[PDB]
Amino acid sequence: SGRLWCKAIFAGYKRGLRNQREHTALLKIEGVYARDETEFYLGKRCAYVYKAKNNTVTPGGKPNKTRVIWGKVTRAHGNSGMVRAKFRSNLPAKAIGHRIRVMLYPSRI
Amino acid sequence: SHRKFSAPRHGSLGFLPRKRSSRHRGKVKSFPKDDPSKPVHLTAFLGYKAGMTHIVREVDRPGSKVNKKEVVEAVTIVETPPMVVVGIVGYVETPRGLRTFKTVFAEHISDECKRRFYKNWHKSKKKAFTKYCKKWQDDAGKRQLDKDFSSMKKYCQVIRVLAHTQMRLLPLRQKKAHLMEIQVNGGTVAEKLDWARERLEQQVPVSQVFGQDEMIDVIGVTKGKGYKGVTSRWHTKKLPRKTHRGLRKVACIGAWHPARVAFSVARAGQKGYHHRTEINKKIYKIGQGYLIKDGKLIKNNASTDYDLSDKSINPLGGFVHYGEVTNDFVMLKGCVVGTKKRVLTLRKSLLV
Amino acid sequence: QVLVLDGRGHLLGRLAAIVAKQVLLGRKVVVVRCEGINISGNFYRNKLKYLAFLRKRMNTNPSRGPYHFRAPSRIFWRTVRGMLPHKTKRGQAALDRLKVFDGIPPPYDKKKRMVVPAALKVVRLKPTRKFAYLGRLAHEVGWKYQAVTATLEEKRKEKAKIHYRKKKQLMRLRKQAEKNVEKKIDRFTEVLKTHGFLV
Amino acid sequence: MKTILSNQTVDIPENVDISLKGRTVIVKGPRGTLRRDFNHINVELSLLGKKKKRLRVDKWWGNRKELATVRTICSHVQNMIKGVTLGFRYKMRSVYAHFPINVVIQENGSLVEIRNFLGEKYIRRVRMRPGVACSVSQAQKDELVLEGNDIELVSNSAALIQQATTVKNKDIRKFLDGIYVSEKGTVQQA
Amino acid sequence: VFRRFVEVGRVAYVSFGPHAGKLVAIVDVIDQNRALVDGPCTRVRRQAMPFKCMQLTDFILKFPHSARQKYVRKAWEKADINTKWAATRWAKKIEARERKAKMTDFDRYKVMKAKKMRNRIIKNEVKKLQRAALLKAS
RNA sequence: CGAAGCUACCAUCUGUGGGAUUAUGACUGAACGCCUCUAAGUCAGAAUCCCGCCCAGGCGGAACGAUACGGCAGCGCCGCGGAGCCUCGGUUGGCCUCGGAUAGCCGGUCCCCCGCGGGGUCCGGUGCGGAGUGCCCUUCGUCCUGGGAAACGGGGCGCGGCCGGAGAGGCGGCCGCCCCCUCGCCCGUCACGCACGCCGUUCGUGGGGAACCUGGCGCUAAACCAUUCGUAGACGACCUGCU
RNA sequence: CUGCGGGAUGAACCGAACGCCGGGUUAAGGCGCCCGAUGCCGACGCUCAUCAGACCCCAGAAAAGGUGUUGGUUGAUAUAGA
RNA sequence: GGCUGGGAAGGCCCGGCGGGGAAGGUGGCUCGGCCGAGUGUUACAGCCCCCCCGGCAGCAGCACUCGCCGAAUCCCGGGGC
Ligand SMILES: [Mg+2]
Ligand SMILES: [Mg+2]
Ligand SMILES: [Mg+2]
Ligand SMILES: [Mg+2]
Ligand SMILES: [Mg+2]
Ligand SMILES: [Mg+2]
């Protein structure tokens, strides 16, 4: 009946100054601003939800315009609560600074 | 290398968007500063350049060789028939600027003023302000107008009045009136608003705001001269006769290292028809137009205390390319911008 | 979902960096009262720096040259733009999310505005150091609407004083009403103070 | 280095009543009331003892530059107390060789006009700071008296009327003309 | 206008560090920003502690500036610093923060229901008082 | 010899005010019991800089008028309904004092002053902020009846009046009349496709743009071309006239 | 004849040398924003510039001065009173 | 496990020796109601601190985390990719 995912922001890809690696994304989870609260979110499933012109299938429902790219939290990123994530397909780079929902049910607590 | 002999540059960099003026009527860029101690008054008027003539006057400057000596000075005649107030406009101060707050028009609008609202009067159905005048003759409209006046009184700080010229009284071919906002400077906002509301649908003579021997500002557009060369546009030096590729040019457009020609380099283009604002124009005489009590009264135009004749300012055969001056006129010392029939904006001095 | 920040007492670059970083993350940020921005160093230093910036112009055509905006809000906007990749589409999209105002406009005059302690002068600057106000600097380099902004801010502060007086009356009556019916809420108050409330 | 503690005390008379609004000293007495805001100085302004007999200023962990403020605030308070009790009177004499200096007060003492300075046809109208009243001194051929409660304003007005009478484009060592302050005292000596 | 001073025997509260959230007493001053500290009754040994990580309360017990960890403990026990600290609003607020930290979801639901009833009762009383005040004004 | 028009310091007219300060000269005042333009603070200060006056006017806004009666038509406001293409962000809100930092917040104000409120003195409570954004506000299952505490609250884009709000108001506050419901907290009482573990669930949204199906209240054109004129002009453009 | 990371930029500098990839860790360099990372409750001091300063090659300064400020060395006199 | 066969510290302390901050003391002075607070001077210890003689389990690189080097003098368990 409510929200069961944490808010996160697609900050960008794993990169140096002049080289970009698109197979690993950087996530900014709201409320986490240290490399000590990220242990909870390790291994959590994350999805990027978006809509498109054509209809697609929907598990347990009628076809809709929503498509997602599923992912997984891998490790923390540099003392600031940033989280590295890997998706089955690399993010479109259109979602930079957009909403990414990290699920809560790879539960291990 | 430096130029061998120094010479001041030709033209002024402060006047050189040299484009044909977007507007035909002169525009007051800045009205006189408003202080709430003097009574309410207007600060602008519209006239028409009629012609030029002579004048004879004794000088009263001690120490000069011309003291107590009669002189001949050029004076220009500007016919100024009275204007009709048709509406008022309010403004509010803003950190971004000064935007208009509300505009209220009068119940009755002359056809001359309605001419300005249509590009093709012949093909138009003349439907302008047909539903607006219903406000002035209905209780709901009257209440709305009262609320508008109250809001302008409460919020506005700058009040301007819309007035149009009476082209019927001029001998010009055109019949479309010129409409201009005139800022009212005087007491408090409420007093100025009430005074402007009283003057609605009323004629304002030129003698009310302008007086004799007063310095004023004249605003208008220059005579158009079309495309002109750099020799005439900027008064540059002419190349000698031996020049092959033209001598009415500028030899060195620019240097090498900056691979562009600067905006300060004189070039050919449009000359004339530029908006200008001259300062310190003195009113030698404010004339009274033709009036009839028993017959025609034509003496007052050109009769003086020493001539006492029945002359009018109109020369024999009338003014050249203008016509006959019949309404009130203002005599300014010297010359003013614009050609004949050109509408001129008369503005009060911005300085003490 | 929109950040509104009060610019009074905040350092220029310290606030600009944080605002730019938040704006790049898709956050909508509104900066208010940009005349309260202050810059480190004495007033003459910053005056000379802005005059030196004013000297920068294209020799052949100053119209195409740098645009020297005089309003304090536009000065802050340019400083923030200097910290963004404004040449790219992403930078322009981020910069569209930023919104600055001189004074406090009516759309935001009835909103609570946050402050950033990491950009405040009282925190980041020594009490013995000198600083310059952005409003005075702007007024001396071409700004036109300092007095109008001051008058409007005075009126807004009077209105806010009226509202704050009403809020004080409401809160005092709330506190008294809590005392009046304290017996009927004893069990509700005990459980609240058991878990760390009202203590 | 940093000095652990530096302090100084001012012993005010029983006539003067002093109060502090945190770091703003308000001094009132027989002649009037003087206000001076001591912000931007970062000192501990303490008013100790009954009847407010003594005023103490403290400075904790201050370097060499911040240390002089402790003495300068005490000096300012002493001057303010002296002005509120006795006041400040500045006597200045006009010096000339050939052209006599004609000085006339205009409104009460605020507007002062100087005429016939080195034969100049120009007349200087000099406005003085509020609270200071000028007058033409008696028992002296050419002397002016400046009176007020605040020493700063009286001295600033005296400097203004000193700099008004300045010789230009000539040897100032030879042309020793103008009005110069001759005595810095109090209105009442007691 | 200062009411808190770094005095020998001043009780200080440690904001952060190894001994965070534990009372301690100042023994001697080492430098400008470092002092010798001792916490015998609060499980804190004698070692240097910077002034940055300590916020000192309004409790001052008297003992010599270089006592050997034995007389400071005796003074702490005689003054009964623990009970006085527990009676202060500061410790109560700290305990309220800890209780909020340790609150479980069931306790959160109970608090939600309690606030749901209490705020409604209080706001009804506030509305009645506002109506009475408006009646009195007229 | 010469009209009109162009034209010449070869004729005639016009050419402006503030702010911050540089150099410099000063006031108060230590460092350094004295002295000092400087350290804190303050004054005067110019062909300097900025602005005003002046010229142009933003992929910048504002107010106002008329808004296509036609021989086919097409619109503008209101409410409540149906599919039908494109485009996306989201996944409760906070409706607000001024403000200082070697200080501040809250009441009563016995006392005084000023226009229910504001200001001052005094007094009493907190200040690592519980009148804390380390925060507050709302619950996020439904329905039956069956008890206690609390209680006249809410709704029908509920219908009509009084206002505040003009910086870029675009939102709310205060009163009258009809009908309907027993909503918040604790326990009894069952029933709600219980779809038999599997993902985009849950909303702001009746979202925004374009085209078509219901009604009530108001509409009647202007712009351009063509022609005409020269205050205009290379051509465009510009100033004008025409039941 | 040589790509790659850093020095903003780049012959020769620093690191390190090349098949197509996944994971982890480093060098030289960095961690306010552009721009990945100090969003450490970092430590100790110095510095106010109306020409501040900010990292080999490298992109700029000398002699001589300053009671501006912060430390050190030496030498005297001061309760027989500086 | 080793070390300075760890350095200090904690508790009962006992029989002593000297020295120094300068205190339930004295005292010129100052601030309030004999007391409370602030300065100086010779200065024993009834506020203490330090060295020398000597001895008790109470230790342990100590979850009172004041600073080491470590691993046949070392093993177990869990989480993520
Ligand atoms: Mg969705
Ligand atoms: Mg030359
Ligand atoms: Mg040839
Ligand atoms: Mg000036
Ligand atoms: Mg000045
Ligand atoms: Mg100076």
Curated annotation (Swiss-Prot), chain A:
Listed GO CC annotations: cytosolic large ribosomal subunit; synapse
Keywords on record: Acetylation, Cytoplasm, Ribonucleoprotein, Ribosomal protein, RNA-binding, tRNA-binding
Chief place of localization: cytoplasm
Any one GO molecular-function label of the UniProt entry: structural constituent of ribosome
GO BP term (any one): translation
Residue positions, PTM N6-acetyllysine: 7, 62
Matching Pfam families: Ribosomal_L35Ae
Subcellular location: Cytoplasm
Location of N6-succinyllysine modifications: 62
Quaternary state and interactors: Component of the large ribosomal subunit.
PANTHER family linked: 60S RIBOSOMAL PROTEIN L35A (PTHR10902)
Functional note: Component of the large ribosomal subunit. The ribosome is a large ribonucleoprotein complex responsible for the synthesis of proteins in the cell. Required for the proliferation and viability of hematopoietic cells.
Family: Belongs to the eukaryotic ribosomal protein eL33 family.
Protein name: Large ribosomal subunit protein eL33
Species the sequence originates in: Oryctolagus cuniculus
UniProtKB/Swiss-Prot annotation, chain B:
Residue list for modification N6-acetyllysine: 135, 285, 293
BP terms from Gene Ontology: translation
GO cellular component: cytosolic large ribosomal subunit; nucleolus
Main subcellular location: nucleus
Cross-link (Glycyl lysine isopeptide (Lys-Gly) (interchain with G-Cter in SUMO1)): 293
Keyword field contains Acetylation: yes
Residues with Tele-methylhistidine modification: 244
Keywords, ordered alphabetically: Acetylation, Cytoplasm, Isopeptide bond, Methylation, Nucleus, Phosphoprotein, Ribonucleoprotein, Ribosomal protein, Ubl conjugation
Domain of life: Eukaryota
Region named Disordered: 1-36
PTM summary: Constitutively monomethylated at His-244 by METTL18. Methylation at His-244 regulates translation elongation by slowing ribosome traversal on tyrosine codons: slower elongation provides enough time for proper folding of synthesized proteins and prevents cellular aggregation of tyrosine-rich proteins. It is not required for incorporation of RPL3 into ribosomes.
Modified residues (Phosphoserine): 12, 303
Places the protein is found: Nucleus, Nucleolus; Cytoplasm
Residue ranges with Basic residues bias: 17-30
Gene Ontology molecular functions: RNA binding; structural constituent of ribosome
Positions of crosslink type Glycyl lysine isopeptide (Lys-Gly) (interchain with G-Cter in SUMO2): 38, 223, 225, 285
PANTHER family: 60S RIBOSOMAL PROTEIN L3-RELATED, LARGE RIBOSOMAL SUBUNIT PROTEIN UL3
Subunit record text: Component of the large ribosomal subunit. Interacts with DHX33.
Family: Belongs to the universal ribosomal protein uL3 family.
Chain's role: Component of the large ribosomal subunit. The ribosome is a large ribonucleoprotein complex responsible for the synthesis of proteins in the cell.
Protein name, as recorded: Large ribosomal subunit protein uL3
UniProtKB/Swiss-Prot annotation, chain D:
N6-acetyllysine PTM positions: 121
Gene3D superfamilies: Ribosomal protein L6, alpha-beta domain (3.90.930.12)
TM stretches of this protein: none
GO CC aspect terms: cytosolic large ribosomal subunit
Keywords noted in UniProt: Acetylation, Cytoplasm, Ribonucleoprotein, Ribosomal protein
GO biological process: cytoplasmic translation
Subcellular localization: Cytoplasm
Main location class: cytoplasm
Pfam families: Ribosomal_L6 (PF00347)
GO MF annotations in UniProt: rRNA binding; structural constituent of ribosome
Superkingdom of the organism of origin: Eukaryota
InterPro entries registered for this protein in UniProt: Ribosomal_uL6-like, Ribosomal_uL6-like_a/b-dom_sf, Ribosomal_uL6_a/b-dom, Ribosomal_uL6_CS2
Family of this protein: Belongs to the universal ribosomal protein uL6 family.
Function: Component of the large ribosomal subunit. The ribosome is a large ribonucleoprotein complex responsible for the synthesis of proteins in the cell.
Subunit structure and binding partners: Component of the large ribosomal subunit.
Identification of the protein by name: Large ribosomal subunit protein uL6
Organism for this UniProt entry: Oryctolagus cuniculus
UniProtKB/Swiss-Prot annotation, chain E:
GO annotation, biological process: ribosomal large subunit biogenesis; translation
N6-acetyllysine PTM positions: 78, 84
Keyword Acetylation attributed: yes
Cellular localization per UniProt: Cytoplasm
Keywords (A to Z) from UniProt: Acetylation, Cytoplasm, Isopeptide bond, Phosphoprotein, Repeat, Ribonucleoprotein, Ribosomal protein, Ubl conjugation
Modified residues (N6-succinyllysine): 84
Modified residues (Phosphoserine): 138
Primary site of residence: cytoplasm
Cross-link (Glycyl lysine isopeptide (Lys-Gly) (interchain with G-Cter in SUMO2)): 123
Residues making up the signal peptide according to the UniProt record: none
GO molecular function: RNA binding; structural constituent of ribosome
GO cellular component, one term: cytosolic large ribosomal subunit
Subunit structure, interactors included: Component of the large ribosomal subunit.
Role of this protein: Component of the large ribosomal subunit. The ribosome is a large ribonucleoprotein complex responsible for the synthesis of proteins in the cell.
Family assignment from sequence similarity: Belongs to the eukaryotic ribosomal protein eL14 family.
Name by which UniProt lists this protein: Large ribosomal subunit protein eL14
Organism: Oryctolagus cuniculus (Rabbit)
